[PDB]
Structures are given as C-alpha cells and as structure tokens.
Amino acid sequence: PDWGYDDKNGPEQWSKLYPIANGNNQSPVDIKTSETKHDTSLKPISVSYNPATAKEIINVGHSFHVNFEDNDNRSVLKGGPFSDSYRLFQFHFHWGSTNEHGSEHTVDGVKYSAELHVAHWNSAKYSSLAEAASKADGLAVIGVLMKVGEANPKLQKVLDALQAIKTKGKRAPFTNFDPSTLLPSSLDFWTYPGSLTHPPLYESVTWIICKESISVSSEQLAQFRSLLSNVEGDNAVPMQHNNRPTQPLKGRTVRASF
Ligand SMILES: CCCSc1c(F)c(F)c(S(N)(=O)=O)c(F)c1F
Numbered sequence: 001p002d003w004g005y006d007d008k009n010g011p012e013q014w015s016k017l018y019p020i021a022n023g024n025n026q027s028p029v030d031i032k033t034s035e036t037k038h039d040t041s042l043k044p045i046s047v048s049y050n051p052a053t054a055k056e057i058i059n060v061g062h063s064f065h066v067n068f069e070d071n072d073n074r075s076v077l078k079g080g081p082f083s084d085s086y087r088l089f090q091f092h093f094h095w096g097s098t099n100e101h102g103s104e105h106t107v108d109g110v111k112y113s114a115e116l117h118v119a120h121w122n123s124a125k126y127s128s129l130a131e132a133a134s135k136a137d138g139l140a141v142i143g144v145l146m147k148v149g150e151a152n153p154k155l156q157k158v159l160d161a162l163q164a165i166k167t168k169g170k171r172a173p174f175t176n177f178d179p180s181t182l183l184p185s186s187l188d189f190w191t192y193p194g195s196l197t198h199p200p201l202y203e204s205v206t207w208i209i210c211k212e213s214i215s216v217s218s219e220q221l222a223q224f225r226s227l228l229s230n231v232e233g234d235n236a237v238p239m240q241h242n243n244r245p246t247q248p249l250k251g252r253t254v255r256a257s258f
C-alpha cells in the first residue's frame, strides 16, 4: 500500500496521501485527566458477544485482524454514549518496537506497551460496515490499554493462532471466541469523538477508552513483533510497530463515565 509505519510511509507523512490526517477529529489522543468532564448521562457500557460469530484471523501486513460474522445482532455493544446498537466486526492490537511505548492512546502522557481495539458498526442506522465506515456516527471502538507485566492467559487462543498467519495475506479460521473475555473487569471509560488511527483515517469513530488496563507480558508482545510484514518466500521483515502518535484535541472534550 501507499502507507505504513516506516519513516518514509509512516504517520508523519500520511497527510500527503490522506489530508484528513490533519483533521479536527483525529485519533489517538492523550487523555489529560484534569481536563476530562464527568458526564452523568453516560450509561454503562453493555457488551454481549456470541463466540459463534468469530470467523477468521488475517495478517494484513501492518497488523493482524480477528474478524467476525456481522450479518446480524448476535454480537453487539450498547450503552455508554450511544442510543444505537453497534455490531461487533473485528478486534486487533497495536504495539510498539519496545515495551516503553506501543499504545496509541496515552493517559496524562503515560505510554502503555500495547492497545487492544474492539471495533463495531452502527447497524441501527446503516446497512453495512462499508456504509458506516465514513459516517460521523458509523463506528464505535473500545480501546484497552495493555500494561507490560504478568502474562495474560486470556490472550492465548490469539497468540497460538499467529503461527498459521506468519506472513502478509495468510488467513485462517478462528472460531468460537468471545472477545469480551479480553476486556478489564471494570468498564469505567472515557469517550470522545475521533477517527480511525490509520488510513483511511475517517472521522467516524466514537472511542470508548477503558480506565483500567489489562496485562501482557514482554514475551507475549514479542509474539506480535515476530509476525512478518512480507509475503511468504521474501526477506523476513518483522512487524516491529504499528502505533500512531497522539494527535491534537482541537477543542474536543473527553468525557468520563466515572
Ligand atoms: C474503513 C473500514 C474500517 S478500517 C479500520 C478499522 F476497522 C479500525 F477499527 C481502525 S482503528 N485502529 O481506529 O480501530 C482503523 F484504523 C481502520 F483503518
């Protein structure tokens, strides 16, 4: 593709092909907790996912995705800031080249070692992801900051699957999996209107950022960085990082549920 995370094709240069990279609703952001506004109309987040909607795991060159069947409302996110039901379609991670950084969102300047994104589309209003993806109210993404520490057992099925999708474009069945098992036990959150965090960078996402982190070990992070961005039979090029820097808030308000 014309974009990636290298020096030449990376975030700093994305605006050349994708001008919205310099938009007013870009993500991720730094959440400054002294500038959050507690909002009492925010309802609790409700997730209800059916593990039979898990579909496939794919290496996309810059990351890997776990996609879900989204033909119906078997797996849905509701509550929080939403009046609409949002249908689960994918989860994935971001990571950095070492443990020091790797999250996309930061909290009061603090960088975590990775970040989980659980992505949903507005099926009350739209008929497909493709329709929803560019609408201001189209997408809802839960982000969970991942703090290097104890190995997290709940990552296991994901990590065990990586050996079948080592290189760009490989894909395999990934079934019977409920990604609510990856979320932290408190679902207290921050929410703000923003964007996809890589091209096409659409400003279509209501972000739900969990206040509590989940763990990951330094060895489970290495399993992500050992995926390869090349296709089979080319020079091996590890996927060292895929996090975008934080972007200017431009007057947006981050709301706290707590
Ligand atoms: C156009 C159809 C959506 S592609 C996409 C996406 F689904 C995400 F969840 C994200 S993210 N990483 O903001 O969750 C993303 F950056 C994307 F580009």
Ligand SMILES: [Zn+2]
Pocket (backbone or CB within 6 Å): 092, 093, 094, 117, 197
């Ligand atoms: Zn993401």
